[PDB]
């Protein structure tokens, strides 16, 4: 769970997101794991919670792809190889020691307050 590069929290003031002990720059692979690629139907139902679905199907977050919560300024994201198989976690915008690593969602998965626009 804990790693010299980051740690899992379970934080003093955070839900279940990741903590960036670093120390990362713009474009740093913080971590990477495998995932599952299944179609909707019973899959989307039974796994209705931590499923990273793309425009074609719904996959599962094998590594720590689910723990990533939704933040207004996520300083870290992830990448996907050809399909929803290999999942990576880069650092969109350098991070400082003591930050929280998380990722956004997209059209689906709503956040809360529509305050992410300057228009």
């Amino acid at each position: 769970m804990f790693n010299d590069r980051v740690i899992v929290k379970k934080s003093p003031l955070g839900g279940y997101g990741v903590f960036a002990r670093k120390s990362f720059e713009k474009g740093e692979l913080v971590e990477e794991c495998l995932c599952i690629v299944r179609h909707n139907d019973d899959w989307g139902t039974a796994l209705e919670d931590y499923l990273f679905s793309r425009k074609n199907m719904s996959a599962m977050a094998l590594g720590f792809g689910a723990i990533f919560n939704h933040s207004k300024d996520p300083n870290a994201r992830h990448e996907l190889t050809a399909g929803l198989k290999r999942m990576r976690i880069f650092t969109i915008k350098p991070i400082a020691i003591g930050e929280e690593i998380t990722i956004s969602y997209g059209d689906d998965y709503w956040l809360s307050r529509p305050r992410l626009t300057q228009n």
């Binding site: 909707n40 499923l51 425009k55 994201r77 997209g106 998965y109």
Partner: peptide, 21 residues
């Protein structure tokens, strides 16, 4: 609510992607 509502949806996804709308 006083309007055309759509429960079912062919484009019903879950978590967006890194760069694939």
């Amino acid at each position: 609510g006083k309007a055309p509502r759509k429960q079912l949806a062919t484009k019903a996804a879950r978590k967006s992607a890194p760069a694939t709308g």
